[PDB]
């Protein structure tokens, strides 16, 4: 089977401009396991991103957490770019501090 990833971009703690935090990109509900995830800062790939070990839910779909340390500001824009075999083109989800 093939299941499309569900994507959520949010921060570890509530956003406060100028203060350190962690940008999270959680991808879940997908199958098969290969997936490409990138964290973006103003359209460019962030270099130091870490991710959790591959695991799966009771319905067999996989999930992964990709995260990086960051300092929000009002000018800078962040997003998560995901590519999977079920996607005709990479899906990008921008970070909104209210979700």
């Amino acid at each position: 089977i093939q299941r499309t990833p569900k994507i959520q971009v949010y921060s570890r703690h509530p956003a406060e401009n100028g203060k350190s935090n962690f940008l999270n990109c959680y991808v879940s509900g997908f199958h098969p396991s290969d997936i490409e995830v990138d964290l973006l800062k103003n359209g460019e790939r962030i270099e130091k991103v870490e991710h959790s070990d591959l695991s799966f839910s009771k319905d067999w779909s996989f999930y992964l957490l990709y995260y990086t340390e960051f300092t929000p500001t009002e000018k800078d824009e962040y997003a998560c770019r995901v590519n999977h075999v079920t996607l005709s083109q990479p899906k990008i989800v921008k970070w909104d501090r209210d979700m």
Binding site: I1, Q2, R3, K6, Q8, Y10, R12, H13, P14, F22, N24, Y26, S28, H31, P32, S33, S52, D53, L54, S55, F56, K58, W60, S61, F62, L65, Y67, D98, M99
Partner: protein, 276 residues
């Protein structure tokens, strides 16, 4: 039940790119504690939470040989599965397994588990009696007759009722400061106008452990299940989780809506309203 131990195995073939990859992860409730990946330069089983590190050198060696043996076994299984489904050696396939035990409030086996899947579909599962199997198709039926003949359910039953329960109890003692500590959710409500006639109310729940939580929106005490948008519970990255439920309401009627939060880290249920 109150607590559980689960191991998740994933084996993936990748023709033209080496031998099939084998990953194993272990959890106690919502906390990962071990990891193994045959693709790691010098594959060893690694600790993922502080309380497992106190285990001696022989625990790590024994774990590593089990996962190394599993790598071999699952590589054989992927080859066998191709024949059962008349598939070519040119495609990429996945076998997943999930097994473990649930401990009830009294500290004894509540129920055992052991399920396998092929390409994301159920393949074979151990029944709750820990004696029989449910095969999903005619291919799994072959594995089933093989497992009945080798008396596999009996081996699993011994494990699930014994070792699985002893070790889960041991990990709970060793990691009690975190494993047996519920972190209640820090809750708050936000308001976001969408137009002159409607506003979005968002009920947030942050910092909780374990993951299990219930967030409900109520209009004059009636559950707005049909109009509530909920996000899937998500990890924060520091062991805790987050979740929010939102509802679009008519401007000025915000006070007729309440958010209800239920979590075992809370003495009694929380009721939130939007305070302007």
């Amino acid at each position: 039940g109150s607590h559980s131990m689960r191991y998740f195995y994933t084996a993936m073939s990748r023709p033209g790119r080496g031998e099939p990859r084998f990953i194993a992860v272990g959890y106690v409730d919502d906390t990962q504690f071990v990891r193994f990946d045959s693709d790691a330069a010098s594959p060893r089983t690694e600790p993922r939470p502080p309380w497992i590190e106190q285990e001696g050198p022989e625990y790590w060696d024994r774990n590593t040989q089990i996962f190394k043996t599993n790598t071999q076994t699952y590589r054989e299984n992927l080859r066998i599965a191709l024949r059962y489904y008349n598939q070519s050696e040119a495609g990429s396939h996945i076998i997943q397994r999930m097994y473990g035990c649930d401990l009830g409030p009294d500290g004894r086996l509540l129920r055992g588990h052991d399920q396998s899947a092929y390409d994301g579909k159920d393949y074979i599962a151990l029944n709750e009696d820990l004696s029989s199997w449910t095969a999903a198709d005619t291919a799994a039926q072959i594995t089933q007759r093989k497992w009945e003949a080798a008396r596999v359910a009996e081996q699993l039953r011994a494990y699930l009722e014994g070792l699985c329960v002893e070790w889960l109890r041991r990990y709970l003692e060793n990691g009690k400061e975190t494993l047996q500590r519920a972190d209640p959710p820090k809750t708050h409500v936000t308001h976001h106008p969408v137009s002159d006639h409607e506003a979005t109310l968002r009920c947030w729940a942050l910092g909780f452990y374990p993951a299990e939580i219930t967030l409900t929106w109520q209009r004059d005490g009636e559950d707005q299940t049909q109009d509530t948008e909920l996000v899937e519970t998500r990890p924060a990255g520091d062991r805790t989780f987050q979740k929010w439920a939102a509802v679009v309401v008519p401007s000025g009627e915000e006070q007729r809506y309440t958010c209800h939060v239920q979590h075992e880290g809370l003495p009694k249920p929380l009721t939130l309203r939007w305070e302007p």
